[PDB]
Amino acid sequence: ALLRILKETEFKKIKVLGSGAFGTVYKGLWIPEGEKVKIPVAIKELREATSPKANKEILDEAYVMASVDNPHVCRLLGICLTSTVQLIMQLMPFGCLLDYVREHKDNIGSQYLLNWCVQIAKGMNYLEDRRLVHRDLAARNVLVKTPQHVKITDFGRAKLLKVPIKWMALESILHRIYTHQSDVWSYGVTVWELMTFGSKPYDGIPASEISSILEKGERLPQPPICTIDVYMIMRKCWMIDADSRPKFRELIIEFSKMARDPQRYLVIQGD
Numbered sequence: 001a002l003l004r005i006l007k008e009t010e011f012k013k014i015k016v017l018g019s020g021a022f023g024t025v026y027k028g029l030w031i032p033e034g035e036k037v038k039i040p041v042a043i044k045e046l047r048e049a050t051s052p053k054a055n056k057e058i059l060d061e062a063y064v065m066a067s068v069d070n071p072h073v074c075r076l077l078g079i080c081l082t083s084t085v086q087l088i089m090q091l092m093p094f095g096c097l098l099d100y101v102r103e104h105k106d107n108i109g110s111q112y113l114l115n116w117c118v119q120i121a122k123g124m125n126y127l128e129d130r131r132l133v134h135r136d137l138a139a140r141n142v143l144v145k146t147p148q149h150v151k152i153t154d155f156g157r158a159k160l161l162k163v164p165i166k167w168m169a170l171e172s173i174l175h176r177i178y179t180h181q182s183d184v185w186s187y188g189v190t191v192w193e194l195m196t197f198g199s200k201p202y203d204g205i206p207a208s209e210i211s212s213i214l215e216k217g218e219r220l221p222q223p224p225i226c227t228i229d230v231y232m233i234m235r236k237c238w239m240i241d242a243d244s245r246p247k248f249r250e251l252i253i254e255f256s257k258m259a260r261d262p263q264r265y266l267v268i269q270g271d
């Protein structure tokens with residue numbers, strides 16, 4: 001019960017920061033109960049889910065989210081129950097890493113890119129450690145606190161209560177299996193996205209075709225900046241054998257290592 005119940009009046013909505021299928025997000029401010037502190041927040045207002053069954057499901061996931069406490073996982077500050085369900089999130093000033101990489105390709109240096117993989121993999125392991133399957137992981141579901149500090153957006157479990165085929169493990173596509181190991185495959189696609197400075201994985205190829213492509217042993221291409229210790233880690237995540245895949249603990253070490261000598265593993269444009 002680490003989940004704060006917020007009063008509609010404790011916060012104000014400044015601007016719409018987009019709207020998805022799940023809900024609508026706003027840049028806003030929140031003045032906590034009996035405090036003269038003004039926190040910048042993101043307010044995830046939820047869609048058509050007013051059924052008593054659904055609201056109990058929402059709340060139950062809201063407590064789960066509210067107990068996920070890790071530096072690289074976006075924190076849930078509280079919930080506001082009124083006419084609509086509002087999820088008061090920590091504001092991420094630089095938007096999503098995908099947009100950010102597509103907007104900084106030139107100035108994004110090897111040392112940052114490698115430290116983002118450690119950061120993502122760190123947050124991911126926390127979920128595998130809490131036995132929570134992310135199910136979402138894409139460069140679009142990683143947000144930017146500071147360009148040095150990224151955080152993962154844990155909505156995969158909530159979104160469950162519009163198919164991301166190109167980020168999915170073959171077992172997820174063909175047998176609807178979601179393990180912390182399918183989370184490793186998605187992680188591979190995400191790290192490929194950052195190394196390509198936000199490219200479309202398998203662009204122009206239809207979703208239906210993707211399964212057979214992967215079955216024919218075909219994978220995502222080698223990104224120009226990538227070395228061989230790098231592009232290898234990527235293909236180990238895309239192993240048809242769900243258990244041949246590296247663990248999130250492994251990925252942390254082989255990237256933590258890699259981050260100690262960046263340019264050795266990434267060929268940017270100096271230095």
Ligand SMILES: *CCC(=O)Nc1cccc(Nc2nc(Nc3ccc(N4CCN(C(C)=O)CC4)cc3OC)ncc2C(F)(F)F)c1
Pocket residue numbers: 017018019025027042043044074089090091092093094095096097098099139140141143153
């Ligand atoms: C690439 C995927 C993406 O756009 N994710 C995204 C979009 C909007 C809102 C969230 N939630 C969220 N956001 C923040 N901070 C944040 C997010 C996005 C922006 N952008 C969005 C694209 N854009 C537009 C449409 O004008 C430019 C600005 C800016 C911003 O910071 C002020 N923090 C937390 C959340 C959370 F609720 F999801 F936790 C994600």
